[PDB]
Design a protein around this ligand. Sequence first.
Ligand SMILES: *[C@@H]1O[C@H](CO)[C@@H](O)[C@H](O)[C@H]1NC(C)=O
Ligand SMILES: *[C@@H]1O[C@H](CO)[C@@H](O)[C@H](O)[C@H]1NC(C)=O
Ligand SMILES: *[C@@H]1O[C@H](CO)[C@@H](O)[C@H](O)[C@H]1NC(C)=O
Ligand SMILES: *[C@@H]1O[C@H](CO)[C@@H](O)[C@H](O)[C@H]1NC(C)=O
Length: 1368
Amino acid sequence: AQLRQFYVAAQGISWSYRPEPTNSSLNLSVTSFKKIVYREYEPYFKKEKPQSTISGLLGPTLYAEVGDIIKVHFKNKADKPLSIHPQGIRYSKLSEGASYLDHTFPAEKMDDAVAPGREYTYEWSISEDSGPTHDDPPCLTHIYYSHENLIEDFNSGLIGPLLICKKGTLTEGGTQKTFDKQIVLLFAVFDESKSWSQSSSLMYTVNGYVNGTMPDITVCAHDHISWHLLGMSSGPELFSIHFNGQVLEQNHHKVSAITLVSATSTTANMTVGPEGKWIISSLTPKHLQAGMQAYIDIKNCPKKTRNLKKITREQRRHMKRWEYFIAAEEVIWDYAPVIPANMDKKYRSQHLDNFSNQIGKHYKKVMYTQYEDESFTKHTVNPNMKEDGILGPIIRAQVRDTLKIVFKNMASRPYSIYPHGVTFSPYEDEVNSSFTSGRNNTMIRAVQPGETYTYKWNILEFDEPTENDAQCLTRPYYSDVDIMRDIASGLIGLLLICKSRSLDRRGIQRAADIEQQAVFAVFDENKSWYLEDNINKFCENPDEVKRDDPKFYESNIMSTINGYVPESITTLGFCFDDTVQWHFCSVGTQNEILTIHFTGHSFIYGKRHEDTLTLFPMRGESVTVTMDNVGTWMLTSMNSSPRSKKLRLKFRDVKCIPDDDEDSYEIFEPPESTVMATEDDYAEIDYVPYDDPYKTDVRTNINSSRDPDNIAAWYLRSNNGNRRNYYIAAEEISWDYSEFVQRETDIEDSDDIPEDTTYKKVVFRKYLDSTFTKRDPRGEYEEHLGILGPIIRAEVDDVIQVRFKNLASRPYSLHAHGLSYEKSSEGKTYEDDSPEWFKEDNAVQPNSSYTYVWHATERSGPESPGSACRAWAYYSAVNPEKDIHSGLIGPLLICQKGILHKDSNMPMDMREFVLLFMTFDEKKSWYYEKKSRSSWRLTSSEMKKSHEFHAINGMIYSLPGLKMYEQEWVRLHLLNIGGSQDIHVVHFHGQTLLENGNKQHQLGVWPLLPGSFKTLEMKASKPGWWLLNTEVGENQRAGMQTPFLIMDRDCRMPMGLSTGIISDSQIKASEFLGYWEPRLARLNNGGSYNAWSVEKLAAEFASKPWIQVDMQKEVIITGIQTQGAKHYLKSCYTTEFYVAYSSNQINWQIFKGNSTRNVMYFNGNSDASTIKENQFDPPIVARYIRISPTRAYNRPTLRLELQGCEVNGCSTPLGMENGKIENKQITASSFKKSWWGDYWEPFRARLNAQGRVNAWQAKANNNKQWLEIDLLKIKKITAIITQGCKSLSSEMYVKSYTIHYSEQGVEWKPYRLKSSMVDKIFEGNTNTKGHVKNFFNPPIISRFIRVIPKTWNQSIALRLELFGCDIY
Ligand SMILES: *[C@@H]1O[C@H](CO)[C@@H](O)[C@H](O)[C@H]1NC(C)=O
Ligand SMILES: *[C@@H]1O[C@H](CO)[C@@H](O)[C@H](O)[C@H]1NC(C)=O
Ligand SMILES: *[C@@H]1O[C@H](CO)[C@@H](O)[C@H](O)[C@H]1NC(C)=O
Ligand SMILES: *[C@@H]1O[C@H](CO)[C@@H](O)[C@H](O)[C@H]1NC(C)=O
């Protein structure tokens, strides 16, 4: 529980990015100088502490543990205002360090920017909420920076690691007890162009050094190393960190490559190998083009005192030599098997010398080939290896095993093989086998033609497969001499690390079909090593390289799946109740991430079924899909950019019920139960007799016309039932992008709105009838949805038959992820060979409605112990990128049983916020009619192409409806539909996000990969206005900044109408009755004429006399305490009513929240004299409130009191009402003592007291008296309210009071306006029972409060109350 005090200061240096701290006087530098960074100091800023050899620009690590309050003294020294902003802490408004309009007072604006040469102090209390849980690494790593100017401060330096660990796991010096060494790395992309001194620069660095020249990291042998990898970049950049020859453990997954996104952080294991020096690099092709490397040195330390654990079995069982002969060979290859060319390339040329059309494409690749004999004299290997194209033979390696690799280069250029993630185990030590590795342990002889040599690979007990992992892991292998132009060449491979023990080089399990190799390789022929002979010699053109391309650099590059273009890959085939093993890998020099989608089928990923998978460059990912829905489907890439879109693999799914036939085609197999071992000609007949799914469906009968009830009949074969009917339609409306931030709310970059921000686009709108004649108005729950369509929700095992009617000018359809469905209910129109009866769902014509029947099942539900609900999405699928853009998109939520109300399907457990972090390229949208356009000067001038309106739900700034209470669990359904090379790192200011499930991981920010629908849980920390934003600077500066509001926990306070705060003139009504004035209606109790009534109730509608309450200030109101008024055996009360709210007196909105009607009809009060309390489920913010009765007993008559809290601040009783403020805290000078009155003691002044109420009194009745409030700590006091005392056959109260406040209790600093040193006179009260509320223009941030009754009517009396919250 120790307090950790750190000292930092942002100071200027002269950095050169070169490895040298001091090597020579003269400097030859890549263009950058004079940056600013902050470094740690000794206490009281004596002199700078020595910096580590590794951390050049990386700041000091501010280590801490939960329960430790850390104070950072920030004495700025650079010549620019700056600040420090954390990332994963429940920091307050005084230590946030971020400058936006939070409507906070000037006392709390000092943290946003400190002037140079002026000090401050940052306090970040760490609690159990923002700390590591079980199943979580001991130390969580975050990054803190300067929030004054995120674009300019980062690029000029100003970065620091931030570790928050568990309890008792941190030493005095900040080192974990269990880990021998901890190393902090910063893969940052510094840009000196957007810096203090603009010099053209794009250097790619680790820590503060460029070109992989950071000094080597020296570690001992077989050591436990904990890594803290940070990645930051001003623009969207992706880091794919790879530890060559090593394996790490990240989030209970043993992986060789760690993937990071800009402005993120990660921690992981590492167990070091015996000897030798390795290298770590980045697998991103543009990152590998530059250096971005670090060298890790492993030296056998004699003084290490190695335990010699020797944890190994070394017993003959479960191991075999498994010799593999993979001698590479130079071949000719056809990227497009246009003519039926099968079984690889035994026959070589058959060439027409034309790149297009028939064979003769002549893309001369060097692929790996498998042999069987020592001398390689005969090929000797020819498995049925069709549809496995340019791929090295697959190596299946068990745990504990070893294997042998032999090459014989039959090409001209020397080549090699690099086991990527295959020498993951500590590579066997060598003395001469290094083969001039270049001091990197990289075994590359670069085998010459007619040369042969052998590699040794192995594995220890600790292995990449883990308990929470797939059966077999995927890891590729390639060459090292030139990565780009050999990946562009045929030197490609893929091998598996199978945890399953029973493989024996025959097969893993002959019950799961193995469609092992599906590799999206992008071979760039313009980068091919054999370009000169290929391109020129075999065309009707002269001899020029011609790499400047009108088309060539785009025409020659071909995206293929296993070396075959998807336009000529024959359809696949798997039968019913079959498991299929898929091993994907993105290896082509695309530099862009790739996502894939299974139509009608879902994976198993961890313990989730994801239905969509994202691929990173040179990282292997393996999933297993089980066939469940009959018919034909496909795999497709959802990136769907005009570059590299057509990547589709069509696979069938048939009931393979005729098991009597023995002849099963060997590969591409319908697998029998018994395990025997101890293009064209694929998806055709002689496959086990496959029943035509289009004429033998049991789910759908095609003899008669399609009926949704008939289809849902077979779906509802169980007791679940629960049909959920949704009537939805597509309508074209004029949409606002910036109308909420035109002149108010958050800052705007679209100054003066050069365009109207009123683009026309089509959206989803829900209806209640099948006639589509009446609309269902959007309530307050969904007012944050914006452009998103209605929330379609259902339970598990349910069937959702949805009726969709097109009301636009173009055909639109409806396609839903995750949920199971027939081909008769789908939105995608591909070549599925379907009849015309399955093609009526593909496109829905205007003025026509089609009913879709989806069946929620076990695959579409959340985990067993995980989050309650999980999110999918539905969108028009006639043309996706033209349909998700233009506004056709919506959320689809599925939850476990017993969570949604039957009549209205809304979960009552937790609030749900659906946010679609996507940007809308309006050029892609339809209705993009350009008139008098092209007036823009640059290609990035106007927001039609320069800015894609980076928005959260269609609104660039200040998305409304984001309201939640503090200390409240809310469920966040973060979505990202399709997209392309755009990963959003979602950051909530002052909040930490928990990833629920079977592991319970806690994060500060979440990188949102495209196509991922991640559901999280968040607990609000403190009230106020906090900023929701993506953490990338350049996308945040121009959008994605929604200030969301966190309300007080106790927002149930009388907003007036009973105490007397609301003036008599602030209340009006539509009609009268005679002496039943609207003035009397506000009072909750008392009075002979005590309420408001009218003559009679209307008939056609409410059309009822309303009553309006004025506030002169927007406040949060949560409920209303309505009651009747009975008098002389006559009773009257409002039985039913609805409430309308508005900020001004023009735009009136009727309240409807969680109600199965057009508007809410509150249940009213059954009998008079009984206070009935109602609650508004989302609290409403407004200034005027109109409540109008709809039904009542006899003549309507109403008394009303409003409950709520003040907005944009802490307005809660700090005490003085409940027992929170002890009697021993507060006191005063002198009390009146009388025998009959006993003691008129202090500490009895409380907001409401009765009997012998003791408000306050004085035994002298003079000017110098006061009442003192002694809070335990420094608190923020906002408002004070006074109410005098009881009549007591007299009339005693105060007229005017003056305030002095102090912290130590001796200073007594008066509170006054900036006029002069005279106490400000505060308004008193006239009523004996009335409450008069006084606000503070600056809030008194102090401990002690003195209030002095300067002006008094009689013996001084006072029953005060205080409001506010704790500071930290
Ligand atoms: C790190 O590795 C050890 C053993 O390999 C494992 O027990 C632990 O759970 C891993 N994760 C940590 C320490 O966060
Ligand atoms: C060194 O780094 C620069 C960027 O700062 C990069 O352009 C250059 O290619 C690197 N050097 C080599 C040999 O790749
Ligand atoms: C659809 O019907 C409406 C009549 O309600 C008609 O005005 C419209 O022209 C028709 N066609 C389209 C494409 O909306
Ligand atoms: C929401 O409405 C349902 C019925 O419409 C009701 O049972 C439930 O109590 C409501 N929830 C809240 C928080 O008012």
